[PDB]
C-alpha cells in the first residue's frame, strides 16, 4: 500500500499512542510466499546459527532464546525478495521522519532471519534494548502460511507498560509489526511447536546510537 498514508495516518498515531502497530497483509500473498521460499532455502542450506545475546555471562544462550538466525544485508543472491521487504520497511520509516516520538531515525541493523524450530523453543521475557544501544523501533515481518497458534504456539506476547492488557501477536503470514524497542515493551516468544519464521530489523535513533558507538569504541 502507498507508504505515505500508511505511515502518517496509521503507523505514526498507533506508535505514539500504544507503542505497538500491526499492519496485516503487508506485501500480499505472492511476495510473502517468495520470502518464505528464500527463508526456507537459508534454513535448508545450513545458514542459521544459535541466536545470541547482547551480554554473555555463564548461561547457555539456549536457556534464553531457542531460535537460529542469520543476518541478511538484502543484496545477496537468493535473498532478493527479503531485500524488497527491507526496502519496503525502510520506505515506511522514511515517511515517518520526525514523527515517531522524539527520535531521529537515520539507520538500522541488517535483517535477522530467525527460526524457532518447533520443539517448544521460544524466547524468555526480555527487552530488545534495555541499556541504550541505539535501537528505538523493532520491525518484524512474519511469514508462516498455515500457522494455527492455538495448536502451534509461538505467540509474541508484549507487555506494554501502563496498559490494562497485554498484546498477543500471532506470527501470522504477511503480518508486519512495529514496537518501541526500549523498556516500554517487554516481550516473550511463547513456546513454538512447529517451525516458525520471522524477519526482524531494528531502527536506530541517531543520537542514542552515536552515544552507544562511542561507548563501544572507547571500551
Amino acid at each position: 500500500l502507498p507508504a505515505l498514508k500508511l505511515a502518517l495516518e496509521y503507523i505514526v498515531p498507533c506508535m505514539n499512542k500504544h507503542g505497538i502497530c500491526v499492519v496485516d497483509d503487508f506485501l500480499g500473498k505472492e511476495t510473502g510466499q517468495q520470502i518464505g521460499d528464500e527463508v526456507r532455502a537459508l534454513h535448508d542450506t545450513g545458514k542459521f546459527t544459535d541466536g545470541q545475546l547482547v551480554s554473555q555471562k555463564s548461561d547457555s544462550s539456549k536457556d534464553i532464546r531457542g531460535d537460529k538466525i542469520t543476518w541478511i544485508e538484502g543484496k545477496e543472491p537468493g535473498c532478493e525478495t527479503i531485500g524488497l521487504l527491507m526496502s519496503s520497511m525502510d520506505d515506511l520509516i522514511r515517511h515517518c521522519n520526525g514523527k515517531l516520538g522524539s527520535y531521529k531515525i537515520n539507520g538500522r541493523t541488517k535483517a535477522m532471519v530467525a527460526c524457532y524450530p518447533g520443539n517448544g523453543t521460544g524466547y524468555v521475557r526480555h527487552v530488545d534494548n534495555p541499556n541504550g544501544d541505539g535501537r528505538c523501533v523493532t520491525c518484524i515481518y512474519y511469514l508462516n502460511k498455515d500457522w494455527d497458534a492455538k495448536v502451534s504456539g509461538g505467540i509474541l506476547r508484549i507487555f506494554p507498560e501502563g496498559k490494562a492488557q497485554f498484546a498477543d501477536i500471532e506470527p501470522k503470514f504477511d503480518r508486519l509489526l512495529f514496537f518501541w524497542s526500549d523498556r516500554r515493551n517487554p516481550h516473550e516468544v511463547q513456546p513454538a511447536y512447529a517451525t516458525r519464521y520471522a524477519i526482524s530489523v531494528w531502527y536506530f535513533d541517531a543520537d542514542e546510537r552515536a552515544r552507544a558507538k562511542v561507548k563501544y569504541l572507547t571500551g
Binding site: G51, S55, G107, R108, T109, Y123, D128, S200
Partner: peptide, 20 residues
Amino acid sequence: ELDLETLAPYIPMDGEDFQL
C-alpha cells in the same frame, strides 16, 4: 535485579550499520 542486557537479542556493534 537482573542485568537485562543478558536477555537482549544481539546486534553487531562494530562495522557501520545500514544508512537510510
